[PDB]
């Protein structure tokens, strides 16, 4: 139980993680199926017990690196898996290793997922934080006040379009 193994049963084969669950099978059943014709449960041919089949963890691997002109310090994100193979921090996107989490919120420099973003900042290292959405500037309000400008500024921005 709780290990990625292979399956060789009387009426079932495959590869995945086996574990006990609360599923209920028929008296003459040997194996179940999910919505898409893929097995996710099986009964022990010898004992009366039903064990779910969770396939082994898999997911893409991605690196969080700043520019090569800055440093070679790099973190790694194992997408969609809890920390198995492992400066470690679990996110809702995966196990991020090589980055130190901080409670201070900043602007998103390098996106990761689930609101998390990284950045190379100060003895410099890579950090991970919940990205901020800008500073709060709750303006005054009342039934009798108004704001009127006294000066202005002529801005000239730029816009590219293929």
């Amino acid at each position: 139980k709780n290990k990625c193994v292979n399956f060789n049963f009387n009426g079932l084969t495959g590869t995945g993680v086996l574990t006990e669950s609360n599923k209920k099978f028929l008296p003459f059943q040997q194996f179940g199926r999910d919505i898409a014709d893929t097995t996710d449960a099986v009964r022990d041919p010898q004992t009366l017990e039903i064990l779910d089949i969770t396939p082994c963890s898999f997911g893409g691997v991605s690196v969080i690196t700043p520019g090569t002109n800055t440093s070679n310090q790099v973190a790694v994100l194992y997408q969609g898996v809890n920390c198995t193979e492992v400066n470690v921090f679990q996110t809702r996107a995966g196990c991020l290793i090589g980055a130190e989490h901080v409670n201070n919120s900043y602007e998103c420099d390098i996106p990761i997922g689930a609101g998390i973003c990284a950045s190379y900042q100060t003895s410099q290292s890579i950090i991970a934080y919940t990205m901020s959405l800008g500073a709060e500037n709750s303006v005054a309000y009342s039934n009798n006040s108004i704001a009127i400008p006294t000066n202005f500024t002529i801005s000239v921005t730029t816009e590219i379009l293929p």
Binding site: A36, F58, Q79, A93, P111, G115, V139, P149
Partner: protein, 313 residues
């Protein structure tokens, strides 16, 4: 506005942990590498479609503690701070009326549902406290009873009718916001534009998985039943048919999702236009920001989309 981000390992879907299969797949070229680049390019667009729509303002705004908006009650639109999820009573209805292991993996979104509401609330507090000014620089305080006086002038109506009939305007407004709750809670077909976006994707994913069980002219759809049954030089023939069939099923999925990302990228570019001309201002375009003479608009988030509340005269 956005779609469900997906990515597919083109090695595990076709060759389910088989050394003989991966060796034959290596000779087909870079079809495997190309498909990951397309889906990876799609998933990045779904994060831009939210920035170009919700992140119209860098500065966050908040309402004052004394909600004196001149007879107008925005309680059903503004967030409930007493809740754990900072969303309004109307957003609660939209987030409830809208209802694998073969290499298929769903990547999460960059911005969470709590992050979207911080933007949606910032635009409400600006449109209420400032109106059209925070969309053109620094926010300027203007009371709400005086906002509508300008918005009434912008549609060819002198501002005498507002101050003389504030009680009627405020009751018609609050009475109308209440009907939106009853309509959304009763009629399920209101969120049909967003429900098709989810069902259309799941139909393609479930069809992608059902294509694995097909034989494609071979002795069987399983690899173990071929390598453990037939000789090497004969299994290579049967395996080559599945690789050609399973690979054509991916290109049909990618080519479809690559077209659906255009219909969604055109709708997101519209919603970004409506979150600027209608919300951060007053539009003179007919029937663009609602039927009738336009006064103002109030956005509300939703799963993979937006919901505008167009006030009209």
């Amino acid at each position: 506005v956005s779609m469900t981000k997906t990515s597919v390992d083109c090695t595990m879907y076709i060759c389910g942990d088989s050394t003989e299969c991966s060796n034959l797949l290596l000779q087909y070229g870079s079809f495997c590498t190309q498909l990951n680049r397309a889906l990876t390019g799609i998933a990045v667009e779904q994060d831009k479609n939210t920035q170009e729509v919700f992140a119209q303002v860098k500065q966050i705004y908040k309402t004052p503690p004394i909600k004196d908006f001149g007879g107008f009650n925005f309680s059903q639109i503004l967030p409930d701070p007493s809740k754990p999820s900072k969303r309004s009573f109307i957003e609660d209805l939209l987030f409830n009326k809208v209802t694998k292991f073969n290499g298929l993996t769903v990547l999460p979104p960059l911005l969470t549902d709590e992050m979207i509401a911080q933007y949606t609330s910032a635009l409400l507090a600006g449109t209420i406290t400032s109106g059209w000014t925070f969309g053109a620089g620094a926010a300027l305080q203007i009371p709400f009873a005086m906002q509508m006086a300008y918005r009434f002038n912008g549609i060819g109506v002198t501002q005498n009718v507002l101050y003389e009939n504030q009680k009627l305007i405020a009751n018609q407004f609050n009475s109308a916001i209440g009907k939106i709750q009853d309509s959304l809670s009763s009629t399920a077909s209101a969120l049909g534009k967003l429900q098709n976006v989810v069902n259309q994707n799941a139909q393609a994913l479930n069809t992608l998985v059902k294509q694995l069980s097909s034989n494609f002219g071979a002795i069987s759809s399983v690899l173990n039943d071929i390598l453990s049954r037939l000789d090497p030089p004969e299994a290579e023939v049967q395996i080559d048919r599945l690789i050609t069939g399973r690979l054509q099923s991916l290109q049909t999925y990618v080519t479809q999702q690559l077209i659906r990302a255009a219909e969604i990228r055109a709708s997101a570019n519209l919603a970004a236009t409506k979150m600027s001309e209608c919300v951060l201002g007053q539009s003179k375009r007919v029937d663009f920001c609602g039927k009738g003479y336009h006064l103002m608009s109030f956005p509300q988030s939703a799963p993979h989309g937006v919901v505008f509340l167009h006030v009209t005269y």
